[PDB]
Amino acid sequence: ASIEVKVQQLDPVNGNKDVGTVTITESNYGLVFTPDLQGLSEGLHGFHIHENPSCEPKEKEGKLTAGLGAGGHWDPKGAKQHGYPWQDDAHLGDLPALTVLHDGTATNPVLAPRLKHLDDVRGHSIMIHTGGDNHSDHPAPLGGGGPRMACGVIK
Amino acid sequence: ASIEVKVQQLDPVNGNKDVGTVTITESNYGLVFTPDLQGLSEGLHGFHIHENPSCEPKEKEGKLTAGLGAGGHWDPKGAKQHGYPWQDDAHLGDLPALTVLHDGTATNPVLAPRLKHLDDVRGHSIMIHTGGDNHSDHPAPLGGGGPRMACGVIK
Ligand SMILES: [Cu+2]
Ligand SMILES: [Cu+]
Ligand SMILES: [Cu+]
Ligand SMILES: [Zn+2]
Numbered sequence: 597a598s599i600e601v602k603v604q605q606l607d608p609v610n611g612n613k614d615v616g617t618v619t620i621t622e623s624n625y626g627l628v629f630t631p632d633l634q635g636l637s638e639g640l641h642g643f644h645i646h647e648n649p650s651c652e653p654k655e656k657e658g659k660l661t662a663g664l665g666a667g668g669h670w671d672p673k674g675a676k677q678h679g680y681p682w683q684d685d686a687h688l689g690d691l692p693a694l695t696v697l698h699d700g701t702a703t704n705p706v707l708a709p710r711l712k713h714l715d716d717v718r719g720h721s722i723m724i725h726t727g728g729d730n731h732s733d734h735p736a737p738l739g740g741g742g743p744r745m746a747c748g749v750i751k
Numbered sequence: 752a753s754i755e756v757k758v759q760q761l762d763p764v765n766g767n768k769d770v771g772t773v774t775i776t777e778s779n780y781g782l783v784f785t786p787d788l789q790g791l792s793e794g795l796h797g798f799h800i801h802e803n804p805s806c807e808p809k810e811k812e813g814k815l816t817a818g819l820g821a822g823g824h825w826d827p828k829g830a831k832q833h834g835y836p837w838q839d840d841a842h843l844g845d846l847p848a849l850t851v852l853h854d855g856t857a858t859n860p861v862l863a864p865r866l867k868h869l870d871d872v873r874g875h876s877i878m879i880h881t882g883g884d885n886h887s888d889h890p891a892p893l894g895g896g897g898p899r900m901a902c903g904v905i906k
């Protein structure tokens with residue numbers, strides 16, 4: 597199937613920067629997210645669909661905060677819990693973590709088996725966090741992803 | 752229900768070395784492989800089920816070659832080509848690539864959606880390659896995984 601999402605590193609003060617794409621296709625097992633990203637920090641990063649079609653910042657306690665315009669994790673079924681990509685009572689936007697190599701690149705595709713159709717993700721955003729993802733709300737909320745590092749709107 | 756696989760770095764000269772475990776569980780979307788590994792080279796590593804329940808080496812053209820006793824990629828449906836974990840006409844043993852972090856550890860779980868029950872993978876081996884996996888036989892065979900670096904028998 598295919599949606600090419602342009603992703604930018606978020607910096608409300610100094611300016612957002614292009615870091616590449618995430619291409620979304622359909623497989624017989626769910627949606628596949630194929631990154632082609634550069635310039636990110638080495639490690640595993642939380643990777644989720646967020647509810648709003650926006651990567652804009654929003655104030656939080658008077659601080660203009662990167663990516664908050666995207667809202668929370670996409671949760672149309674009201675799971676109200678962060679979890680695993682293969683967990684039915686987790687947010688539907690919970691994707692497998694994104695791998696960024698030592699050289700700052702990400703090319704490894706990942707499968708979201710609960711997302712079945714491309715139209716399901718249109719009108720939302722894809723977020724890449726500074727932290728990782730332990731697929732739980734303990735010991736940190738939302739898998740420990742923390743701040744929003746990079747984002748793209750899915751059209 | 753689960754299977755705990757003991758994994759070792761393959762060294763036909765001075766003996767295999769313990770590097771941790773891979774735990775296989777069932778989800779509603781297929782088998783989940785949760786690593787708990789250490790001492791490995793950083794990066795993405797090809798990760799596949801091989802046909803024989805053996806991690807022993809075999810001589811191939813005068814050289815005692817690591818992990819060759821495991822045979823080829825597990826392919827009970829005779830796909831006869833290497834591909835994606837979500838591709839039906841790929842080897843059934845084709846798993847998502849494993850992520851080893853800078854510190855040599857791997858703990859990020861991956862899903863094999865075409866694998867449905869624990870019993871189906873007993874009596875095979877799980878292989879970790881030195882190279883990665885682009886999920887094609889192009890431009891390199893078997894995703895570019897190359898030599899066999901670590902292995903466990905699924906019992
Ligand atoms: Cu590194
Ligand atoms: Cu997120
Ligand atoms: Cu392999
Ligand atoms: Zn979530």
Ligand SMILES: [Zn+2]
Pocket residue numbers: 799824832833834842844845893
């Ligand atoms: Zn294969």
